[PDB]
């Protein structure tokens, strides 16, 4: 199953109501593929054959 629609996640009290106020983090987060980091931060392409 693939999830396309993203909504404002609520982490505690204060209802977000789709405005992102207090305790309303964003579901999508960026990575950081840079060669100046460590080994674990490097990108890895994974293919699953079922």
């Amino acid at each position: 199953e693939r999830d396309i629609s993203t909504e404002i996640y609520q982490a505690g009290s204060t209802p977000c109501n789709g405005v992102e106020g207090f305790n309303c983090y964003f579901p999508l987060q960026s990575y950081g593929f840079q060669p100046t980091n460590g080994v674990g931060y490097q990108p890895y392409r994974v293919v699953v054959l079922s």
């Binding site: 982490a11 505690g12 009290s13 204060t14 305790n23």
Partner: protein, 50 residues
């Protein structure tokens, strides 16, 4: 629930534990370190900064 009914905060971040999982799991050795800093230094209080 005794933190969001009489005091408003600004930054709240729990590293290593989800903020919504503080009700089912127990705790051990609860230490509170309180201090006062500058607004431009709030980003410097995190495990892995400079």
């Amino acid at each position: 629930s005794v933190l969001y009914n009489s005091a408003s905060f600004s930054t709240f971040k729990c590293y290593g534990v989800s903020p919504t999982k503080l009700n089912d799991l127990c705790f051990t050795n609860v230490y509170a370190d309180s201090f006062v800093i500058r607004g431009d230094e709030v980003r410097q209080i995190a495990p892995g900064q400079t």
